[PDB]
């Protein structure tokens, strides 16, 4: 199910979002992170940026580079 495990806190300034059809990441304004709930199925095909708007496209920072910028245990899921 798309209500994937764990959660953070707040909306704050500009954020990331995960694809619920794979697991790839995209940088978004906080106006989208306030619209997307845990139940909201955000995916690559819906992505704002047509350069990255597929499960087959790339991302702004690889999962082991982004999770280090936040300083967190993301991608450890393997799923």
């Amino acid at each position: 199910g798309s209500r994937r495990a764990s959660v953070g806190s707040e909306f704050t300034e500009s954020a990331w979002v995960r694809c619920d059809d794979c697991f790839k990441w995209r940088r978004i304004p906080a106006s989208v992170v306030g619209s997307i709930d845990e139940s909201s199925r955000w995916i690559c095909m819906n992505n704002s940026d047509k350069r990255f708007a597929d499960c087959s496209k790339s991302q702004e920072m690889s999962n082991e580079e982004i999770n280090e910028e936040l300083g967190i245990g993301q991608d450890e899921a393997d799923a």
Partner: peptide, 9 residues
Amino acid sequence: ARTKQTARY
């Protein structure tokens, strides 16, 4: 959609 937000201004 499990995610987070960067501590980088």
